[PDB]
């Protein structure tokens, strides 16, 4: 696309021949790929292999600044987020770069906001929140037409961190506040309440019973939800900027905003640092398979890095600086978003 | 002063001792070193100082006994000012590992200090240290450059507590802005108040700044001086300010050649605002068709704006007779039409 | 296959004998050790018929290659490929193996991957194939984890090579710096490089522009990520 | 009856060729430990992933069919699958004047 002096498709050149025609007066991009059986990568000499190869294959105007992204594979769409509103993107058709959306959810208040955005695994709802905004609100997928089922309530409050687990039928969020709620999609009343932090919490991750928070004041706690005992403190050197959990393996990612990623580990007290970069890291996302995981950062650089040490496979460069990154679960499809723009990536090995 | 080492002593003596009682103190130009080293030891560990400023000729020694002083546990001072002192890249390191070790300050004024590239990237890693309150910070003729301000924005993003922070005579105009705004949309951004002056701001500036300033932004002040930025400019400028959700407070506006077809747009956005408190103009040609049509408008609106100020080429009967009539119209509204402790360096 | 230090033994008394016949023997992951890599020592050393070897994921640490160099690096041997991944080296081994390289005669090519070799390695490395006697053909580095001092020897030992025709340097954080003086060193006659494992993407525009600079001249060369580009289509073929 | 064989039919299409085959195999160890209920062994060979699903719900019911497949999905190593057959099971398992003349001028 933009690496490219210019991006071109078969049936493209046919089109501009034609018109010439008309008015009287490699070398050729691809387009993505979903049955497992035409992906045809030859083997090394599901898959737990490490990446080796990628390539851009779409680019989605937005219109505004881009804070938040999710991408589904199960269904081909892409969400995106802005200050001002969502818009949800298709990726069946065969086009460079898309202006129009497969559908536009705009929100009207006068000083409201959004912040964060957040699919739900099985890809049938999209939970949504920001700053003086009446309520969490959350959108239904899977029915016929687009409109929003449930509002999760919070008054005056203004959140920055969503999560939500399935199979409990909970969803979490932080505030800046310094709380975390906790509600029961069932009925939709507030379960549980965490507070006693000033600085809030920037970032949150669900797995099991343990909930794991890092903000400024460089520390990471553990939280239980069957007690109400003092969280667990790992002290660090650096303020955190995000998170991220092992599905398979016990390790907690997170990025340290001096260029610093570390692994923990939740059994006992083990670190290590697994990479290092001049800039600061703004999000940390790791792969549904476990071997490997994406990082994006301030200076225009999007990475890949392969679990069992640290190394890092191959990177990517960029114009501006990326904020968010999200990984399908098909382990094949990669999406980042910077200024105004979010780009999409295709894993092949 | 040219001390000796006789009174250089009774004096520093009588600076430690407890019965001294001073607030406020200030060194300059002292002779020879050793007096100037020994005077600034004296400062260790005092109980009554919390103001400090410096500067000289020679600066060998100077660091050496600065950073003894912040490095000290027991050292109050709580704003720190530095002027015209030369240095080489050690001593900005090592007083910035001291400012990392400090605990204490929270106003440091580097103004016109030799400062190049490198200095700058060793005092924004000091700041990016999740452990510094550091709440205003000036860097006046440093002599910085673009690449700084994307370190900047990456601090912006970081920090947590910087409020206030000046830029001035800084050749950062274009790129410099954009940079800053990159750091700036970022939702939770703390920055309040932001100086531009001799920055080289163009248009382009100017719309990167409308774009900031329509969201819900943090920063309350913004200046801009010798920035021209006529036309275009404030275009922008105004229809950012038409709109009822600017919360910006101050604006000052000063040698920015705004010409008669910008005021007409000036005049529509002034009558449209509510939410900003001071306005200020100077060596712009407002002179026969603006200066009447802003009078007018002045007289018919009557916006929230306090204080205003402005320079008329030539003024006759007519014009202080409409002066009266803003003054009748709007009764709160003080108008002058007549520099170190501006206000806005006042406030930082 | 489980085979284990017992079998290899076995194996190895087998191939101890002058008429053997066999010309190529892979083994890995065999739960091999140093015991094992010094029974196969002992068993290289007086035959001329086997040319190729392989010994990867294996545990085979720095010692076991000392004893597989120090029997290679008489002429007799008539060893010509080996490559061993996954084994745990260092840069004492890389120094022996330097020693190898420029002393001797018959090997050809070579492969460590995934080994943390580290500048001092490489940088033993680069003083072994300076030397204008050796005659190695392909060099197989990635994952080995270079830097800047690292690849500017590299570079000047490249600079000062004429033999070496294919290289791999893939998964290695490089600094622009280094790579100005890697890409400064492609670009000189003397070296002939064919192949060249490297992503083009990967870097800045700066230097995306000198790489496609250093391959418009030359216009034999081929820039490829995906190593094995072009390589003998034998090597691959036989085992599968 | 088809309803909750279909999305199990659909569970299945994910496993390759060679897991379709390891995943047949330890079908037949599980088949085989068990004795309250049988199944024959040349059938579960001939049977593709379609058959495979329609056979497994015609012999251990519809719940426990999914129950047996998450298990061995389980032990095959994958775990993405086991949340989106769980999930899928949940699904598809079944609990257990004016105006007037306006409008005629208008016509």
Not at chain 1, 144 to 152: C, R, T
Not at chain 2, 288 to 307: I, N, P, Y
Not at chain 3, 70 to 79: D, I, Q
């Given at each position: 696309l933009f690496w490219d002096k210019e991006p071109w498709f078969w049936h493209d050149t046919l089109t501009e021949q034609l018109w010439r025609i008309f008015a009287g007066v490699s070398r050729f991009l691809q387009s993505i790929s979903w049955d497992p059986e035409d992906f045809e990568d030859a083997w090394k000499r599901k898959r737990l292999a490490v990446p080796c190869k990628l390539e851009k294959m779409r680019i989605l105007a937005h219109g505004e600044l881009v804070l938040a992204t999710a991408i589904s594979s199960f269904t081909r769409h892409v969400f995106t987020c802005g200050r001002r509103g969502i818009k949800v993107w298709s990726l069946t058709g065969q086009v460079?770069?898309?202006?129009?959306?497969?559908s536009h959810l705009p929100i009207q208040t006068p000083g409201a906001f959004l912040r964060t955005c957040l699919l739900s695994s099985n890809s049938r709802s999209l939970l949504t929140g920001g700053y003086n905004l009446a309520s969490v609100s959350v959108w239904d997928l899977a029915a016929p037409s687009l409109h929003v089922k449930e509002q999760l309530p919070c008054a005056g409050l203004n959140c920055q961190a969503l999560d939500a687990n399935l199979d409990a039928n909970l969803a979490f969020a932080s505030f800046t506040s310094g709380v975390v709620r906790i509600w029961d999609?069932?009925?939709q009343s507030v379960v549980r309440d965490l507070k006693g932090?000033?600085?809030?919490?920037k970032s949150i991750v669900v797995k099991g019973y343990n909930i794991w928070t890092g903000g400024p004041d460089a520390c990471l706690r553990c939280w239980d939800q069957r007690t109400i005992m003092k969280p667990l403190e790992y002290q660090f050197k650096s303020q955190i900027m995000s998170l991220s959990h092992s599905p398979q393996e016990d390790w907690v990612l997170l990025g340290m905003a001096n260029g610093q990623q570390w692994l923990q580990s939740t059994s006992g007290s083990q670190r290590h640092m697994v990479g290092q970069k001049d800039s600061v890291i703004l999000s940390v996302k790791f792969s549904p398979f476990g071997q490997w995981w994406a990082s994006v950062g301030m200076d225009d650089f999007l990475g890949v890095y392969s679990?069992?040490?640290?190394?890092?496979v191959f990177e990517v460069p960029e114009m501006s600086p990326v904020t968010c990154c999200d990984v399908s679960s098909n382990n094949r499809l990669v999406v980042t978003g910077s200024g105004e723009h979010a780009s999409v990536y295709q894993i092949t090995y | 002063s040219f001390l000796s080492a006789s009174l250089v002593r009774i004096l520093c003596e009588q600076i430690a001792s407890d019965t001294c009682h001073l607030q406020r103190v200030v060194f300059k130009n002292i002779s020879p070193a050793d007096a100037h080293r020994n005077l600034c030891l004296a400062?260790?560990?005092?109980?009554?100082?919390?103001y400090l400023t410096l500067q000289g000729?020679?600066?060998?020694?100077m660091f050496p006994a600065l950073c003894e002083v912040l490095r000290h546990?027991?050292?109050?001072?709580?704003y720190l000012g530095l002027v015209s002192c030369s240095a080489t890249t050690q001593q900005w390191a090592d007083l910035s590992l001291a400012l990392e070790v400090?605990?204490?300050?929270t106003c440091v004024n580097l103004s016109?200090?030799?400062?190049l590239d490198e200095g700058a990237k060793l005092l924004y890693t000091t700041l990016r240290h999740?452990?510094?309150?550091?709440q205003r910070l000036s860097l006046e003729?440093?002599?910085?450059?673009e690449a700084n301000c994307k370190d900047l924005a990456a601090v912006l993003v970081v920090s947590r507590e910087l409020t206030h922070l000046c830029l001035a005579?800084?050749?950062?105009?274009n790129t410099g802005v954009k940079f800053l705004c990159e750091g700036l949309r970022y939702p939770e951004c703390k920055l309040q108040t932001l100086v531009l002056w001799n920055?080289?701001?163009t248009s382009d500036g100017c719309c990167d700044l409308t774009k900031l300033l329509?969201?819900?932004?943090?920063?309350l002040c913004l200046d801009l001086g010798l920035?021209?930025?006529?036309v275009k400019g404030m275009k922008f400028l105004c229809e950012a300010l038409r709109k009822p959700l600017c919360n910006l407070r101050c604006l000052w506006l000063w040698?920015?050649?705004?010409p008669p077809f910008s005021c007409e747009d000036l005049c529509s956005a002034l009558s449209c605002?509510?939410?900003?408190?001071t306005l200020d103009l100077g060596?712009?040609?407002?002179?026969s068709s603006g200066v009447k049509m802003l009078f007018e408008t002045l007289t018919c609106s009557s916006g929230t704006l306090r204080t205003l100020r402005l320079k008329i080429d030539d003024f006759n009967d007519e014009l202080n007779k409409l002066l009266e009539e803003i003054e009748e119209k709007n009764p709160q509204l003080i108008i002058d039409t007549e520099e170190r402790p501006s206000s806005h360096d006042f406030m930082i | 296959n489980s085979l284990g230090n017992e079998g290899v033994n076995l194996l190895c008394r087998s191939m101890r004998l002058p008429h053997c016949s066999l010309q190529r023997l892979m083994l890995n992951q065999?739960?091999?050790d140093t015991a094992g890599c010094g029974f196969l020592a002992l068993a290289l050393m007086?035959?001329?018929?086997?040319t190729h070897l392989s010994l990867s994921?294996?545990?085979?640490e720095d010692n076991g290659v000392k004893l597989l160099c120090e029997v290679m690096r008489e002429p007799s041997c008539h060893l010509q490929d080996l490559e061993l991944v996954?084994?745990?080296?260092?840069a004492a081994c890389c120094e022996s193996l330097s020693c190898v390289i420029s002393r001797?005669?018959?090997?050809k090519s070579l492969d460590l991957t995934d080994?943390?070799?580290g500048d001092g390695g490489v940088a033993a490395l680069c003083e072994g194939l300076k030397q204008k006697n050796s005659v190695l053909a392909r060099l197989g580095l990635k994952a080995?984890?270079?830097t800047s001092d690292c690849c500017e020897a590299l570079s000047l030992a490249l600079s000062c090579n004429?033999?070496?025709?294919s290289l791999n340097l893939v998964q290695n954080n490089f600094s622009p710096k280094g790579m100005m003086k890697l890409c400064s060193a492609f670009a000189c006659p003397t070296s002939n490089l064919q192949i060249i494992g490297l992503?083009?993407?990967?870097?800045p525009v700066q230097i995306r522009k000198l790489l496609e600079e250093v391959q418009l001249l030359k216009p034999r060369v081929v820039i490829d990520?995906?190593?094995?580009?072009?390589?003998?289509?034998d090597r691959y073929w036989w085992k599968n | 009856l088809t309803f909750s064989s279909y999305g199990l039919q659909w569970c299945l299409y994910e496993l390759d060729k060679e897991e379709f085959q390891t995943f047949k195999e330890l079908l037949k160890k599980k088949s085989s430990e068990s004795t309250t209920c049988s199944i024959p062994q040349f059938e579960i060979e001939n049977a593709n992933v379609e058959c495979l699903a329609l056979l497994l719900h015609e012999y251990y019911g519809a719940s426990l069919a999914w129950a047996t497949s998450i298990s061995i999905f389980e032990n095959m190593n994958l775990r993405t699958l086991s949340e989106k057959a769980r999930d899928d099971m949940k699904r598809h398992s079944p609990e257990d004047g004016d105006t007037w003349d306006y409008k005629s001028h208008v016509m």
């Amino acid at each position: 696309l933009f690496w490219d002096k210019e991006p071109w498709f078969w049936h493209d050149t046919l089109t501009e021949q034609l018109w010439r025609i008309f008015a009287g007066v490699s070398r050729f991009l691809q387009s993505i790929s979903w049955d497992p059986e035409d992906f045809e990568d030859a083997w090394k000499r599901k898959r737990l292999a490490v990446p080796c190869k990628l390539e851009k294959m779409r680019i989605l105007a937005h219109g505004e600044l881009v804070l938040a992204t999710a991408i589904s594979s199960f269904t081909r769409h892409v969400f995106t987020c802005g200050r001002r509103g969502i818009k949800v993107w298709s990726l069946t058709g065969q086009v460079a770069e898309d202006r129009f959306p497969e559908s536009h959810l705009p929100i009207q208040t006068p000083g409201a906001f959004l912040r964060t955005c957040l699919l739900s695994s099985n890809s049938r709802s999209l939970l949504t929140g920001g700053y003086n905004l009446a309520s969490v609100s959350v959108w239904d997928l899977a029915a016929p037409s687009l409109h929003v089922k449930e509002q999760l309530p919070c008054a005056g409050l203004n959140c920055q961190a969503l999560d939500a687990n399935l199979d409990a039928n909970l969803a979490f969020a932080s505030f800046t506040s310094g709380v975390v709620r906790i509600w029961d999609l069932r009925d939709q009343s507030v379960v549980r309440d965490l507070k006693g932090y000033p600085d809030g919490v920037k970032s949150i991750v669900v797995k099991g019973y343990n909930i794991w928070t890092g903000g400024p004041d460089a520390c990471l706690r553990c939280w239980d939800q069957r007690t109400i005992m003092k969280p667990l403190e790992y002290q660090f050197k650096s303020q955190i900027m995000s998170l991220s959990h092992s599905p398979q393996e016990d390790w907690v990612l997170l990025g340290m905003a001096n260029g610093q990623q570390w692994l923990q580990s939740t059994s006992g007290s083990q670190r290590h640092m697994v990479g290092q970069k001049d800039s600061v890291i703004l999000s940390v996302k790791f792969s549904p398979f476990g071997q490997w995981w994406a990082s994006v950062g301030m200076d225009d650089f999007l990475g890949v890095y392969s679990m069992p040490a640290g190394t890092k496979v191959f990177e990517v460069p960029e114009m501006s600086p990326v904020t968010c990154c999200d990984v399908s679960s098909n382990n094949r499809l990669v999406v980042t978003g910077s200024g105004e723009h979010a780009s999409v990536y295709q894993i092949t090995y | 002063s040219f001390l000796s080492a006789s009174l250089v002593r009774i004096l520093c003596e009588q600076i430690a001792s407890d019965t001294c009682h001073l607030q406020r103190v200030v060194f300059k130009n002292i002779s020879p070193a050793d007096a100037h080293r020994n005077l600034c030891l004296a400062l260790r560990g005092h109980k009554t100082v919390t103001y400090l400023t410096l500067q000289g000729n020679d600066q060998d020694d100077m660091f050496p006994a600065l950073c003894e002083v912040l490095r000290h546990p027991e050292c109050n001072l709580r704003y720190l000012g530095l002027v015209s002192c030369s240095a080489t890249t050690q001593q900005w390191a090592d007083l910035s590992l001291a400012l990392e070790v400090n605990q204490s300050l929270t106003c440091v004024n580097l103004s016109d200090n030799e400062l190049l590239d490198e200095g700058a990237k060793l005092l924004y890693t000091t700041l990016r240290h999740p452990k510094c309150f550091l709440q205003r910070l000036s860097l006046e003729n440093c002599h910085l450059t673009e690449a700084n301000c994307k370190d900047l924005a990456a601090v912006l993003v970081v920090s947590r507590e910087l409020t206030h922070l000046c830029l001035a005579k800084n050749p950062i105009g274009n790129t410099g802005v954009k940079f800053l705004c990159e750091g700036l949309r970022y939702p939770e951004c703390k920055l309040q108040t932001l100086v531009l002056w001799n920055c080289d701001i163009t248009s382009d500036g100017c719309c990167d700044l409308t774009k900031l300033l329509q969201e819900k932004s943090s920063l309350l002040c913004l200046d801009l001086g010798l920035n021209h930025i006529g036309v275009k400019g404030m275009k922008f400028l105004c229809e950012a300010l038409r709109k009822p959700l600017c919360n910006l407070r101050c604006l000052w506006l000063w040698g920015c050649s705004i010409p008669p077809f910008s005021c007409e747009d000036l005049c529509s956005a002034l009558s449209c605002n509510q939410s900003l408190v001071t306005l200020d103009l100077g060596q712009n040609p407002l002179g026969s068709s603006g200066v009447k049509m802003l009078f007018e408008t002045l007289t018919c609106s009557s916006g929230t704006l306090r204080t205003l100020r402005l320079k008329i080429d030539d003024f006759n009967d007519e014009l202080n007779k409409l002066l009266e009539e803003i003054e009748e119209k709007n009764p709160q509204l003080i108008i002058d039409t007549e520099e170190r402790p501006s206000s806005h360096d006042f406030m930082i | 296959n489980s085979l284990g230090n017992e079998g290899v033994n076995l194996l190895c008394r087998s191939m101890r004998l002058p008429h053997c016949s066999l010309q190529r023997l892979m083994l890995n992951q065999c739960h091999l050790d140093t015991a094992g890599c010094g029974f196969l020592a002992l068993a290289l050393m007086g035959n001329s018929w086997l040319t190729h070897l392989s010994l990867s994921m294996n545990p085979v640490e720095d010692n076991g290659v000392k004893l597989l160099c120090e029997v290679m690096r008489e002429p007799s041997c008539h060893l010509q490929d080996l490559e061993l991944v996954k084994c745990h080296l260092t840069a004492a081994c890389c120094e022996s193996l330097s020693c190898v390289i420029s002393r001797s005669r018959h090997l050809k090519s070579l492969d460590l991957t995934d080994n943390a070799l580290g500048d001092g390695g490489v940088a033993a490395l680069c003083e072994g194939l300076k030397q204008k006697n050796s005659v190695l053909a392909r060099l197989g580095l990635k994952a080995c984890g270079l830097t800047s001092d690292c690849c500017e020897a590299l570079s000047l030992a490249l600079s000062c090579n004429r033999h070496l025709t294919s290289l791999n340097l893939v998964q290695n954080n490089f600094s622009p710096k280094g790579m100005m003086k890697l890409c400064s060193a492609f670009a000189c006659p003397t070296s002939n490089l064919q192949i060249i494992g490297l992503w083009k993407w990967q870097y800045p525009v700066q230097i995306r522009k000198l790489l496609e600079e250093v391959q418009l001249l030359k216009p034999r060369v081929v820039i490829d990520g995906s190593w094995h580009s072009f390589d003998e289509d034998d090597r691959y073929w036989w085992k599968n | 009856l088809t309803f909750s064989s279909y999305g199990l039919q659909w569970c299945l299409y994910e496993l390759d060729k060679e897991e379709f085959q390891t995943f047949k195999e330890l079908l037949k160890k599980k088949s085989s430990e068990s004795t309250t209920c049988s199944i024959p062994q040349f059938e579960i060979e001939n049977a593709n992933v379609e058959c495979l699903a329609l056979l497994l719900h015609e012999y251990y019911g519809a719940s426990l069919a999914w129950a047996t497949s998450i298990s061995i999905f389980e032990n095959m190593n994958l775990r993405t699958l086991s949340e989106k057959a769980r999930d899928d099971m949940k699904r598809h398992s079944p609990e257990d004047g004016d105006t007037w003349d306006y409008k005629s001028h208008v016509m």
